[PDB]
Structures are given as structure tokens and as C-alpha cells.
Amino acid sequence: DESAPITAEDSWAVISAFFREKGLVSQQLD
Amino acid sequence: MIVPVRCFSCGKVVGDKWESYLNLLQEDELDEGTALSRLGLKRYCCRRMILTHVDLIEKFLRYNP
Amino acid sequence: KYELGKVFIGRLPIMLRSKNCYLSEATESDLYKLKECP
Numbered sequence A: 001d002e003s004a005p006i007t008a009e010d011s012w013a014v015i016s017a018f019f020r021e022k023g024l025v026s027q028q029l030d
Numbered sequence B: 001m002i003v004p005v006r007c008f009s010c011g012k013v014v015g016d017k018w019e020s021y022l023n024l025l026q027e028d029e030l031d032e033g034t035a036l037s038r039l040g041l042k043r044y045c046c047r048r049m050i051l052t053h054v055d056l057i058e059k060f061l062r063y064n065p
Numbered sequence C: 001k002y003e004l005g006k007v008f009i010g011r012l013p014i015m016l017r018s019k020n021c022y023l024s025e026a027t028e029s030d031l032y033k034l035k036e037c038p
């Protein structure tokens, strides 16, 4: 079932990854 | 930073209860609400003291001098 | 037309945490020794 649709709580797992990588000032550094 | 001695609202000593609370969580796996209550922290004024504490001192200690 | 090195030009301020900054490849414990806040 690894191809099951995503829930609403799962969007936070993506947001976690966005910030784990980019941080809060990616614009300034990049 | 560093556990408040005495709850602001009623002044029940809360200074002793810190390590004991942190222990009832790691060692006893217990949920926050039971640990607080175990420690006799019944009034929410007292509960908020421990439950919402941020022991910044521990980061502060990480610097050498 | 017949034919008959590396020079310093200036000091450029670095933005902290950038590639050129020391703190970029810095671990948590590293920053603390450097008296910086992680």
C-alpha cells in the first residue's frame, strides 16, 4: 500500500523536508 | 531558562520537581499529564509552570568559558 | 602586431552561512566552540 493517497497530516512531513533542506533564509544565501 | 522555584500564581515550590518530571518521562515513558499529576501538580497554574518550561540553561552550558 | 600574475584587488564582505563563510559546513558542537549560536 506504498502507493496509497496522502492524508492532510502528511503535508507536514513534506513541509518538514522543505525546511530541513532550504532553511529560513534560503533566498538570502542562494 | 532554569526551572522556576515556586509557581508564579500560587507559589507552590516547583524547583524540586524538575528532574523528577523529566525522569517520569524518559525512564517511566509516562505521558506529560500523568507525570505532572503524579508530582502532585493539580492546579493548572502549577501545571503550566513545568509543562511549558524551556530549560535554555542546558544550551548555555555548551559554551566553554 | 608582434609580441615583444595574480593580483590583489580588494576585500569583499562575506555573508554568514554562505559557501565562503567558515560557518557553512559547521556542525552543532562546532558552532558552540566558535561561540556562535546554532
Ligand SMILES: [Zn+2]
Pocket (backbone or CB within 6 Å): B007, B008, B009, B010, B011, B012, B043, B044, B045, B046, B047
Ligand atoms: Zn500554582
